[PDB]
Amino acid sequence: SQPAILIIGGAEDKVHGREILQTFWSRSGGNDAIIGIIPSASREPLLIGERYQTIFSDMGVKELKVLDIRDRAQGDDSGYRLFVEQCTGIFMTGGDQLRLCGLLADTPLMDRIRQRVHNGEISLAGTAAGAAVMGHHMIAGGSSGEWPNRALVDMAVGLGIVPEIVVDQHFHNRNRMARLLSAISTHPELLGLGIDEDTCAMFERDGSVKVIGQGTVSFVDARDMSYTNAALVGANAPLSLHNLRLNILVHGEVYHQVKQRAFP
Amino acid sequence: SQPAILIIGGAEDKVHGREILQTFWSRSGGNDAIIGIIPSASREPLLIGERYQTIFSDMGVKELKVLDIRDRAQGDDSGYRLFVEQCTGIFMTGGDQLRLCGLLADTPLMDRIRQRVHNGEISLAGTAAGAAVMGHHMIAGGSSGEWPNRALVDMAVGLGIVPEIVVDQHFHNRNRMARLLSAISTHPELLGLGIDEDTCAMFERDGSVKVIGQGTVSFVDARDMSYTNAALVGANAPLSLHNLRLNILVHGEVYHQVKQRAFP
Amino acid sequence: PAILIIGGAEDKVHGREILQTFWSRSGGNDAIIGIIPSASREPLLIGERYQTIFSDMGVKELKVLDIRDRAQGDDSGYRLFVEQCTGIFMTGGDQLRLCGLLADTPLMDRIRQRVHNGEISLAGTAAGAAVMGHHMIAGGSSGEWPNRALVDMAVGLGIVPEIVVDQHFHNRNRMARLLSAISTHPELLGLGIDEDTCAMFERDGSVKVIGQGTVSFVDARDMSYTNAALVGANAPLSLHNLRLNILVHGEVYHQVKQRAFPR
Amino acid sequence: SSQPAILIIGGAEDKVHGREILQTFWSRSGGNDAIIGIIPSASREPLLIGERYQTIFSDMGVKELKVLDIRDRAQGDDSGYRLFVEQCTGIFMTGGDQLRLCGLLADTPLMDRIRQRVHNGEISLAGTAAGAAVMGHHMIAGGSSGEWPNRALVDMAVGLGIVPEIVVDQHFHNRNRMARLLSAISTHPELLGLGIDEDTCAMFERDGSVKVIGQGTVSFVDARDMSYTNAALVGANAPLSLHNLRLNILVHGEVYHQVKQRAFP
Amino acid sequence: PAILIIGGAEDKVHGREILQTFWSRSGGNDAIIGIIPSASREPLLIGERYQTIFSDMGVKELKVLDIRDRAQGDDSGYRLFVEQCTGIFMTGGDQLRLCGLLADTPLMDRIRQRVHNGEISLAGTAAGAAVMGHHMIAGGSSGEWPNRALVDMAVGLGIVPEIVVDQHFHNRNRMARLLSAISTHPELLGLGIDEDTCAMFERDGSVKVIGQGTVSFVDARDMSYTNAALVGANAPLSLHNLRLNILVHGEVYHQVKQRAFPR
Amino acid sequence: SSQPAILIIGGAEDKVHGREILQTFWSRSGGNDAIIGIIPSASREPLLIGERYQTIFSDMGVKELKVLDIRDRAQGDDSGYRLFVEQCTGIFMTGGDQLRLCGLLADTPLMDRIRQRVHNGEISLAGTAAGAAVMGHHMIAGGSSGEWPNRALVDMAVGLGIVPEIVVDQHFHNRNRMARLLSAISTHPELLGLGIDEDTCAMFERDGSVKVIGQGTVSFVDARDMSYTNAALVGANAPLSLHNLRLNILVHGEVYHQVKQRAFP
């Protein structure tokens, strides 16, 4: 029941065993959990907030609240501030990652959530857009069907929960490898995580990353790159990336951030 | 003008500078070239054979012949045998790689082409389906939009021109990374080459691979893999692949097969 | 930063003027406030009440320092919070309970030090006000002339050692027990603080009165005579040449000048 | 001593044991030679309360007693009662309700003559409880406890003006009456406040000294050097401020000197 | 494997019986055939002609060993091909040219050795037939009685040292020059091979005749008398007790038995 | 020697220098005593060719010459010519065309008597070129060179049967006639083939010996011990096989002995 950060690739199971959502429930304190749901990424926040309210209520918790922030000023809310002081876990729904950042970045309520996560007090999960915002550097958009090039990926600032990574989501399902490689070419100091649908990278306080769920997490590491043309070529030109390390993990496998290596 | 093997990712430039096709022309002896065109992969062999006949004729060569093999028995042709004894280069067009192998594998005419290539006497190029057949192990088909799994990729036997590799083609254009990773999981001894449209991996006799053209070649190396679940899981289950080496190269860059490393 | 000594039953519903002042002096939106509900036998309920009020005003961080045994006075987590905080709020309940739990603990030593050094604000209401002096009124009745047996004297937390505090003062007719306390310790300035009233001690030595009622400053430092040394504990006390200043909202008692000023 | 005095008694005085306060009034009225009038007008049971004090003073031994049972203001004209006042050596005003006592006695010929004979030093005067409350010109007629000082807390009225420079409160600490006395002083700061406990007495001597006798305390509340009050600025229900008050709490044997404005052990 | 000695102008258009026999004895579809056009002053054209014929029949590999200077007899690439081949075909042209280019070269030493060891087949037509003996007819006319001056004797490649070959034999009336040669070397069996005819030497010592015309076996090994030692080069030669066998397609001359057999 | 003989001359014999062959015929015909008949019937210029040999033999010195100019087969009945044949010591048959010579002379009384007188050893007989070709019973009348042996190569006909056991060819090596002689022998293997060069002679002596005289060679082609031929099996244009032939090529001074079937130096 140790607090953790769950980075979920979207379209997670809401109907069957709900393994990823049950893990967030357990790491939030299970029957003792006080869980806040942030549906700000969505233009249907009532429907999506109610969906997760029903799921976590059915699992059994102490308290639930939808933190239904629709305008930056709605973060300035007495009940939401109190709830964040009391909570054991926060869940960020899908939608649009630029909308979620637009509404929550550089707000006192999000600064307090981030502080409580960084201090090891509460769990945080984000799915789809809620996963995309985890890095300092965020993939806000970008196509498939192209070789890697700077113009392929739309880069933005995320919420900086895990500043050393760049997240992509619905990863193999939407063929997003080239846009993630294009992001890593821009920021080769960052470990890239490409997270499939109904798959999760769970960050633990000891530096380990545990993979949970149906698909894969791709760890794309350019920290030992021998050469790139990135400095030499135009925005639409193909990128070269030499000596990348790739680790494709499934459920139960671990990537250790200190060791910079994966384990079965 | 040293003979080489050109593995072309499909949809190569036939109209503008024709850089890849001009390289094959030059490595076949230029104005002295005697070039055979094999359009067997295609169900429109007359049209596709004539297209390349016109291109190489315009560049200026000594002789051209379309080796229009449409049934296995049509390989048993006096003129085609003579031409293969005389030729300096062979070009295999696109179409369907299973059709091309169906018609040419385990035939004396293809055995003689392969011998003359292996002995360093003639150049060989293949585009699209003509690239796919270069390995001993061939990707005959497979979808995108999935995490890597054995069932994603259709494996077959190719013509074994370069037995140590597995080729994929139209690679980033058709989002084929997952099917190539699935192929390499099946055969981790083989270096995977994912070749984009209008891009070429040119194999030289010294072991170097020179990249030419518009896009990228992805070298996917599982020879130092630390772990895979491949032995443990079902045909439709996601594959894990730990400690892969990835090199994404562009025009002018080299992968050295002996050194197992890329250079700018 | 300031020390707010609050007479109990402060407004938690309307303008909340006294609690808003503590909020402001603790850094307002940037405040990091610890709530000590140790005086109370319902610490969860009373800690949640002030968590709700300070969250409504808006602060950076809150912690309920729920000390229920003296061993929690050694607790590294609570002691770490005290190093990080900008304000500490001590709730009502029973002042002997609060002192029993917190006095002569590392946690309270550091609260007292950070208050004395002018690093953090401190507020206490009701029992939390009573503990501010070195000498504390722990109990006592009304309806009697001043006599030592009327007042239960104890040791407080020594935040403001030169005063003796009484609280719910006119509301519970506590003047005679405060006079009885001052007879025991005439070197100490007596402060009798009404319900929903506050004596706010500033770093310049001024004491500003805030709220609904009065603060009574009872000064025996120039007393000409008392019978206190001569008489038993149940005997009436005489106290000659006391100075009394009764102050309302906006008025100031200056500790250096030993005199009061209108707004 | 048998020198006439004014005894201002805080109520519930000892009627059973040593009766020290009542014996002092007896002594200052001439002891065995005393001619004492009892005014029970404050009481709605004047017969019972008048008889109670008649029995006490008779037991001590006096020359003559009379209950001056005034029940209508017009009876302050009565020749019989006015004759007795010319003959008496002491007057005792019992407890009850101070507004009733003032209603019946103030600005009557009978009370004008008592006041004159007291001011001329011819007779002693004692009042207990309501009988104490009427001693000033300004009188506390009522008021609660359990509040901060405010003008609405205290019911001010006109007393008999025996000692015009003071305002008396009675049962003082026993009924927690300090806030109502402070409320009275706020708008009469020229007057010395005397808060007199049960079974305690402030005995005004002819030289200006005030001797405290009895079980409890007398509180002298002096706002004559007050530096500030908000009294003129605020409404009747608002809290009062009073800056630079002098307080003297005295016990048996101690003296407040009215000329010196100071207390002595 | 066999040695095909072909009398020139062999059928290249119809049944190609002689060339198909060489193809078969070289391994047919598995044959690795070298073509030596060195006898010819048009080596490219004649090498291409046989490349076309053998490609039409279908073989594994062809190489034209285009030796135009004796230095190419040292060439490692041609010498490597000779180690790998299953058959060698020597075209027409001029037999002195062919010997000038190939005799006493490492390349021809290894061809001769691999033929002698029974590893490869060898065929020669016209000039390529003439070079098969150690003693070679390089030239000479017709229309004369036998005399030494009629025939130009030279050294051949010594593939079949016990014979002397003549070619286009009856077509160009070459009997008198062959008799003149045998007078010089009566230990040697003379073979006069007609156009589009072949003497095929088998490893068992049999010689099978294939094709359109005749092979004349002219045997002076039992000669009773000749004037050859006594007379000048322009004098008529006498040759007594010669044995002559004229063979056609399907017939056999057995070298061990020294006699001919019908089909 | 002056012993009668049969001289079979291969054509183009020396008419200018030593005339060795023609001098041998002169000597064997009786030299200065010779009575020589010349048959120019093979020639279409019989006068010119007859006169040429008349001049040569006259220059050597003889008793009598006559040109037997037969131009029609009926003139083989002529009394004058038949008388001369009874008187003569030698007959010389000139060149021309062997079919013409046989047409005119064969199975005539004149030639029957010449043949009889030759067989009885009374006269010498010489023939050159066409005159040589007619000596056998079987005659080569024509045929080309430049081909392998085949029956169509040679034109076979009937000769005068002077020496029935041989088949003669003439101008032999000079006109490359070996293949046509082999073609003739293939289907008459009982006959000894004699291929006689220009200015060479096979001189048949009465004892069976054949002496070679002159410039070139005589080829004796003997298929009497032939082990096989395909001649009976194949068409006229097909190549002939001939196994186990014996060949003897003789020069001036050498002898072929017909009884021994062997040559001598």
Task: Copy the structure tokens of residue F137.
Answer: 């019973």
CA atoms within 13 A on the CB side of E31: 30
What CA–CA distance (Å, rounded) separates D128 from D11?
5
CA D36 to chain centre: 17
Sign of the torsion angle spanned by Cα atoms B119, B122, B128, B133: negative
Q: Do F176 and E173 touch (CB under 8 A)?
A: yes
What CA–CA distance (Å, rounded) separates D8 from D162?
11
Give SS3 for C24. Answer: helix
Q: How far away is chain D from the Cα of C145, in angstroms, using its nearest Cα?
A: 5
CB atoms within 10 A of CB B133: 27
> For residues B203 and B17, is the Cβ–Cβ distance under 8 A?
no
Sign of the torsion angle spanned by Cα atoms A114, A116, A121, A124: negative
- Show the DSSP H helices in chain B as ranges: 19-27, 45-59, 78-86, 97-104, 108-118, 129-132, 177-186
What CA–CA distance (Å, rounded) separates C8 from C196?
6
What CA–CA distance (Å, rounded) separates A207 from A258?
6
Task: Copy the structure tokens of residue A169.
Answer: 């989501």
Q: Do E245 and F244 touch (CB under 8 A)?
A: yes
CA D135 to chain centre: 4
Which residues touch F129 (CB under 8 Å, ≥6 apart)? F9, F10, F11, F12, F42, F94, F95, F96, F170, F171
Residue whose C-alpha is closest to residue A157's, from A139, A171, A169, A142 = A139
Residue type present at position E22: F
Residue D148: which of C144, C145, C214 has the nearest Cβ? C214
Q: Do E61 and B115 touch (CB under 8 A)?
A: yes
Q: How far away is chain A from the Cα of C63, in angstroms, using its nearest Cα?
A: 8
Residue whose C-alpha is closest to residue A28's, from A9, A52, A10 = A52
- B5-263: CATH topology is Rossmann fold (3.40.50)
Q: Measured between beta carbons, which residues in chain A are less than 8 angstroms from residue B215?
A: 147, 238
Residue of E nearest to F199 (CA): E145
Size of chain E in residues: 263
Match 């200190």 to its residue by tokens.
A258
CA E148 to chain centre: 22
The correct answer on CATH 3.40.50.1820 for the domain covering C2-255 is no
Residues of E with CB under 8 A from a CB of F: 142-146, 170-173, 175-176, 179, 194, 212-214, 218, 224-225, 227, 235-249, 251, 259-262
Which residues touch E76 (CB under 8 Å, ≥6 apart)? none
Q: C-alpha distances in angstroms, F149 versus A59, F12, F173? A: 113, 26, 15
> For residues B140 and B155, is the Cβ–Cβ distance under 8 A?
yes
| CB pairs < 8 Å spanning E and F | 129
**Phi-psi category of C120—alpha, beta or left, where left has phi over 0 and alpha has psi -120 to 50?**
beta
The helix (run of H) or strand (run of E) holding residue C116 is: helix C106-116
> For residues C37 and C93, is the Cβ–Cβ distance under 8 A?
yes
What CA–CA distance (Å, rounded) separates F71 from F75?
7
Residue A240: which of B242, B245, B249 has the nearest Cβ? B249
Residue whose C-alpha is closest to residue D217's, from D186, D194, D249, D187 = D249
Residue type present at position F116: Q
E-assigned strands of C20-109? 32-36, 61-64, 87-90
Task: Copy the structure tokens of residue B107.
Answer: 């035939």
Which residues touch A169 (CB under 8 Å, ≥6 apart)? A8, A9, A10, A127, A128, A129, A131, A132, A176, A195
What CA–CA distance (Å, rounded) separates A55 from A49?
10
> For residues C7 and C123, is the Cβ–Cβ distance under 8 A?
no
Task: Copy the structure tokens of residue D113.
Answer: 């003559």
What CA–CA distance (Å, rounded) separates C111 from C89?
11
What CA–CA distance (Å, rounded) separates F99 from D124?
218
The vertex-A65 CA angle with A61 and A67, nearest 5°, equals 145
DSSP state, residue C141:
-
Residue of A nearest to B213 (CA): A238
Q: Measured between beta carbons, which residues in chain D are less than 8 angstroms from residue C212?
A: 239
Q: Do A246 and B250 touch (CB under 8 A)?
A: no
Residue of C nearest to D263 (CA): C240
Residue type present at position E262: P
Residue type present at position C190: G
Q: Measured between beta carbons, which residues in chain D are less than 8 angstroms from residue C171?
A: 146-148
Quick one: E197 exposed, middle or buried, by C-beta within 10 A (0-12, 13-18, 19+)? buried
Residue whose C-alpha is closest to residue A197's, from A57, A21, A9, A37 = A9
Match 């503008």 to its residue by tokens.
B16
Q: How far away is chain B from the Cα of E51, in angstroms, using its nearest Cα?
A: 7
Q: Do strands D138-143 and F242-250 pair parallel, antiparallel, or not at all (unpaired)?
A: unpaired
Listing DSSP states for A192-216 in one string gives EEEE-TTEEEEE-TTSEEEEEESS-
> For residues A134 and A165, is the Cβ–Cβ distance under 8 A?
yes
Residue of D nearest to C252 (CA): D243
The vertex-C95 CA angle with C94 and C97, nearest 5°, equals 70
Task: Copy the structure tokens of residue E165.
Answer: 């070959």
What CA–CA distance (Å, rounded) separates E64 from E78?
9
Q: How far away is chain E from the Cα of F133, in angstroms, using its nearest Cα?
A: 19
Residue whose C-alpha is closest to residue A210's, from A21, A62, A23 = A23
State residue E230 phi and psi, 5-degree precision: -100, -20
Residue of B nearest to E57 (CA): B78
What CA–CA distance (Å, rounded) separates B211 from B225?
25
Match 């079980």 to its residue by tokens.
D215
The helix (run of H) or strand (run of E) holding residue F39 is: strand F35-39
Q: C-alpha distances in angstroms, C87 versus A84, B73, B89? A: 20, 94, 85
State residue E12 phi and psi, 5-degree precision: -115, 0
Q: Do D173 and C143 touch (CB under 8 A)?
A: yes
> For residues C258 and C189, is the Cβ–Cβ distance under 8 A?
no
State residue A52 phi and psi, 5-degree precision: -70, -35
What CA–CA distance (Å, rounded) separates B220 from A176?
17
Q: Measured between beta carbons, which residues in chain E are less than 8 angstroms from residue B78?
A: 55-56, 58
What CA–CA distance (Å, rounded) separates F108 from F76?
5
What CA–CA distance (Å, rounded) separates B6 from B122?
12
The helix (run of H) or strand (run of E) holding residue D20 is: helix D20-28
Q: What share of chain C is helix, strand, coil (3-state, %, to 5)?
A: 30, 30, 40
Which residues touch E88 (CB under 8 Å, ≥6 apart)? E33, E34, E36, E65, E82, E111, E115, E120, E121, E122, E123
CATH architecture of the domain formed by E2-261: 3-Layer(aba) Sandwich (3.40)
Residue A248: which of B148, B196, B248 has the nearest Cβ? B148
Which residues touch D258 (CB under 8 Å, ≥6 apart)? D165, D192, D208, D209, D210
What CA–CA distance (Å, rounded) separates E124 from E121?
10
Match 């160009």 to its residue by tokens.
E172
Residue E243: which of F175, F246, F249 has the nearest Cβ? F246
- A5-257: CATH topology is Rossmann fold (3.40.50)
DSSP state, residue D168:
E
Q: How far away is chain C from the Cα of A242, in angstroms, using its nearest Cα?
A: 46
Distance from first CA to last CA of chain D, Å, rounded? 20
The vertex-C256 CA angle with C250 and C259, nearest 5°, equals 50
CA atoms within 13 A on the CB side of B36: 23
CB atoms within 10 A of CB F104: 21
Which residues touch F253 (CB under 8 Å, ≥6 apart)? F211, F212, F213, F265
Task: Copy the structure tokens of residue F147.
Answer: 């081909």
Residue of D nearest to C263 (CA): D230
> For residues A108 and C60, is the Cβ–Cβ distance under 8 A?
yes
Q: Do C55 and A108 touch (CB under 8 A)?
A: no
What CA–CA distance (Å, rounded) separates C61 from B247?
48
**Phi-psi category of D57—alpha, beta or left, where left has phi over 0 and alpha has psi -120 to 50?**
alpha
What CA–CA distance (Å, rounded) separates E41 from C182?
142
What CA–CA distance (Å, rounded) separates A213 from A219?
16
Task: Copy the structure tokens of residue C243.
Answer: 């100075």
Residue whose C-alpha is closest to residue A158's, from A150, A170, A166 = A166
What CA–CA distance (Å, rounded) separates F197 from A78?
142
Which residues touch F13 (CB under 8 Å, ≥6 apart)? F19, F21, F22, F128, F198, F199, F201, F214
Match 């942030």 to its residue by tokens.
A38
Q: C-alpha distances in angstroms, C104 versus A59, C74, C108, C123, F124? A: 46, 10, 7, 19, 176
Residue whose C-alpha is closest to residue C174's, from C164, C162, C184 = C164
Radius of gyration of chain B measured on its C-alpha atoms: 18
Q: What share of chain D is helix, strand, coil (3-state, %, to 5)?
A: 30, 30, 40
The vertex-F7 CA angle with F5 and F9, nearest 5°, equals 175
In the structure, do chain C and chain D come into contact, i.e. share 3 or more CB pairs under 8 Å? yes
In the structure, do chain E and chain F come into contact, i.e. share 3 or more CB pairs under 8 Å? yes
Task: Copy the structure tokens of residue B251.
Answer: 């025009």
What CA–CA distance (Å, rounded) separates B209 from D118?
133
Q: Do E214 and F146 touch (CB under 8 A)?
A: no
Size of chain C in residues: 263
Which residues touch F115 (CB under 8 Å, ≥6 apart)? F160, F161, F162
CB atoms within 10 A of CB B209: 25
| CB pairs < 8 Å spanning C and D | 129
Residue of D nearest to C250 (CA): D241
Distance from first CA to last CA of chain A, Å, rounded? 22
The vertex-D87 CA angle with D81 and D88, nearest 5°, equals 85
Task: Copy the structure tokens of residue C59.
Answer: 């602060």
DSSP state, residue C26:
T
CA atoms within 13 A on the CB side of E99: 21
Q: Do E51 and B85 touch (CB under 8 A)?
A: yes
Residue of C nearest to A77 (CA): C56
> For residues C88 and C36, is the Cβ–Cβ distance under 8 A?
yes
Q: Do B238 and A253 touch (CB under 8 A)?
A: no
Q: What is the resolution of this structure in A?
A: 1.5
Which residues touch E11 (CB under 8 Å, ≥6 apart)? E17, E18, E19, E196, E211, E212
Residue C51: which of A85, A108, A115 has the nearest Cβ? A85
Q: Do strands B34-38 and A261-263 pair parallel, antiparallel, or not at all (unpaired)?
A: unpaired
CA A221 to chain centre: 18
Furthest C-alpha separation in chain F: 56
Residues of E with CB under 8 A from a CB of B: 29, 51-52, 55-56, 58-62
Residue of B nearest to E49 (CA): B82
Q: Measured between beta carbons, which residues in chain B are less than 8 angstroms from residue E56?
A: 78, 81-82
Subunits close to F (at least 3 CB pairs below 8 A): E
Which residues touch E230 (CB under 8 Å, ≥6 apart)? none
CATH of F6-264, one of 3.30.428.10, 3.40.50.300, 3.40.50.880, 3.40.50.1820: 3.40.50.880
Q: C-alpha distances in angstroms, D251 versus C227, C228, D5, D92? A: 9, 11, 18, 23
What CA–CA distance (Å, rounded) separates D83 from D65?
13
What CA–CA distance (Å, rounded) separates D90 from D57?
11
Q: Measured between beta carbons, which residues in chain D are less than 8 angstroms from residue C143?
A: 173-176
Which residues touch F120 (CB under 8 Å, ≥6 apart)? none
E-assigned strands of chain C? 2-6, 32-36, 61-64, 87-90, 121-125, 135-140, 151-155, 163-166, 189-193, 197-202, 206-211, 215-219, 225-226, 239-247, 252-254, 259-261
